């Protein structure tokens, strides 16, 4: 597996600078091989070449892999899960601060139990109207975002998959955004609250009466 270091393309054209190769490694295997998977990621240091190209270790770039079988046969990229860049900051480093205090309003997401009956009814109405009825700006579209009308990478064409991120470090980013969508959707339809949460961490006997 040859390691190519790529610099992303802005435009439609596939102009991604993958010219400069960052690394290289090898894999022993065979037929009637014992099935196996390292329980931990293999890390191949690319810091030096990343420094050579004059782009910060922090900044955006990616890594692609050329898998050549020992047979000499060039192999499909699908053979191996795509490489990732892992960044190790100078310890210790505090990431940038949050914005000071609060002003003048933020959507407040409460425990479902903390909801007054009024709040229950009002976000019930918001949900009721968002859901009923259907549109492009409606509930079913957002419900469709996550999974199975399969619009990924694009709703075209040949092979489509679910859009939601799973088995990745970016899972919670994706679903955070999604929850924000839901929030806007309910706010514009007339609810004073941010989307409430239910602690499943707290021991519970039954589902909240809300759902």
């Amino acid at each position: 597996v040859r390691i190519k270091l790529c610099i992303p393309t802005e435009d439609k054209r596939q102009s991604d600078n993958c010219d400069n190769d960052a690394g290289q490694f090898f894999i022993l295997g065979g037929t009637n091989e014992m099935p196996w998977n390292f329980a931990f990621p293999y890390l191949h240091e690319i810091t030096d070449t990343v420094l050579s190209l004059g782009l910060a270790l922090d900044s955006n770039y990616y890594v692609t892999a050329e898998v050549t079988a020992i047979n000499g046969t060039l192999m499909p990229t699908q053979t191996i899960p795509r490489p990732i860049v892992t960044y190790i900051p100078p310890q210790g480093f505090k990431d940038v601060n949050m914005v000071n205090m609060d002003t003048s309003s933020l959507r407040f997401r409460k425990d479902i139990s903390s909801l007054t009956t009024e709040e229950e009814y009002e976000l019930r109405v918001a949900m009721e109207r968002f859901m009923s009825d259907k549109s492009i700006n409606g509930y079913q579209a957002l419900a469709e975002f996550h999974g199975l009308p399969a619009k990924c990478p694009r709703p075209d064409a040949l092979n489509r998959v679910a859009c939601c991120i799973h088995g990745m470090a970016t899972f919670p980013h994706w679903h955070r955004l999604v929850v924000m969508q839901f929030e806007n959707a309910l706010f514009t339809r007339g609810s004073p609250i941010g989307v409430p949460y239910w602690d499943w961490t707290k021991p519970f006997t039954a589902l909240p009466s809300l759902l």
Partner: protein
């Protein structure tokens, strides 16, 4: 504002104290430098007014000048720094210290050269807020200064009015206690900006335009005859950027109600809407005058200047948003318009015509 007696209390006496040192200056020498009595010489030794406005190194000179002044209350119970009043924040009236008629050191100054105390003649959302915020918007230092200087002198125009002995004039302004206090503020504004940059990773204690001029030393702060060691040390341009080694502190660099980070959000927020500006070329003229805009009212802005001042010309244009004017006429920056202006002298007359050339008119999205 927010002062607690006797915090107010200590100071008058200190200002009182230096009214006559009067040896070092004691205060009149300290006054002369911005003021009328002649600071320096061309090599021909001709009178100059050692005023360092109109140039890019404009803040340092002053920001110092506060220092010289600031030091001057030294161990005279100069227990806190010169206060600042945020003229940005709209105000129905002037601030006390400089108003109270009786037994107050801030009412006026005197002038051995003229035999008189200062006379001031005030003249009639907040205008300065809008004007300053723009300055903050900018990222180039030079770009910032032009607006920063012009936002500034708008007050030397309006505080003084039509008295030769006053804040409207270069000659005797420095004499009026009101002048420093206005400054602290002007200086404060500058500081805020530095914090801004710093936030943005742009240079703040440095500045890339123009390398020319920050290096020229500054008189009088240069002069041998300045018996304060400190200012001479930073008499230079490039020193005096980091006001930290002064050493003073502002209570808080927050524009009204805004974290610095908050502030950028604000400006960033403003920036969404596409704007339209007018920019003038301004250049030296002996007199000091105010200029009134038109297309409805678009005005206005003022220029500070006096006899025997070093001539100056700004490198860059001075911008003044006139979008509210267009909406007023319902124009789209598309329909095309005549930008009409007027330009009064501080003395009662007389709106002489440019002088300044023609205003360009430019559009910023968005």
């Amino acid at each position: 504002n927010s002062l607690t007696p006797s915090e107010i209390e200590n100071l008058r006496n200190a200002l009182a104290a230096v009214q006559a040192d009067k040896t070092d200056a004691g205060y009149q020498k300290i006054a002369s430098f911005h003021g009328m009595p002649l600071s320096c010489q061309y090599p021909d030794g001709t009178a100059f007014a050692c005023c360092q406005h109109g140039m890019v190194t404009f803040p340092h000179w002053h920001r110092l000048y506060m220092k010289q002044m600031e030091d001057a209350l030294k161990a005279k119970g100069a227990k806190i720094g010169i206060p600042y009043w945020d003229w940005t924040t709209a105000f129905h009236s002037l601030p006390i210290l400089v108003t109270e008629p009786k037994n107050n050191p801030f009412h006026h100054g005197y002038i051995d050269v003229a035999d008189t105390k200062t006379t001031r003649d005030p003249r009639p959302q907040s205008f300065f807020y809008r004007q300053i915020a723009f300055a903050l918007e900018q990222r180039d230092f030079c770009d910032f200064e032009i607006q920063f200087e012009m936002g500034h002198n708008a007050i030397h125009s309006w505080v003084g009015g039509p008295s030769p002995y006053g804040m409207s004039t270069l000659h005797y302004t420095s004499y009026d206690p009101l002048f420093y206090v206005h400054h602290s503020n002007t200086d404060r504004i500058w500081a805020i900006w530095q914090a801004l940059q710093k936030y943005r990773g742009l240079p703040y204690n440095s500045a890339n335009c123009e390398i020319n001029k920050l290096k020229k030393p500054m008189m009088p702060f240069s002069s041998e005859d300045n018996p304060n060691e400190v200012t001479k040390a930073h008499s230079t341009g490039y020193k005096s950027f980091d006001y930290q080694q002064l050493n003073y502190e502002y209570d808080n660099l927050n524009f009204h109600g805004m974290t610095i980070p908050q502030l950028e959000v604000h400006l960033k927020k403003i920036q969404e809407k596409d704007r339209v500006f007018a920019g003038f070329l301004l250049r030296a003229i002996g007199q000091s005058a105010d200029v009134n805009f038109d297309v409805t009212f678009g005005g206005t802005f003022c220029v500070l200047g006096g006899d025997y001042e070093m001539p100056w010309a700004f490198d860059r244009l001075f911008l003044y948003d006139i979008s509210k004017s267009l909406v007023h006429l319902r124009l789209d920056a598309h329909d095309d318009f005549d930008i009409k202006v007027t330009i009064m002298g501080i003395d009662g007359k007389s709106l002489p015509p440019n002088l300044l050339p023609s205003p360009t008119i430019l559009f910023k999205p968005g």
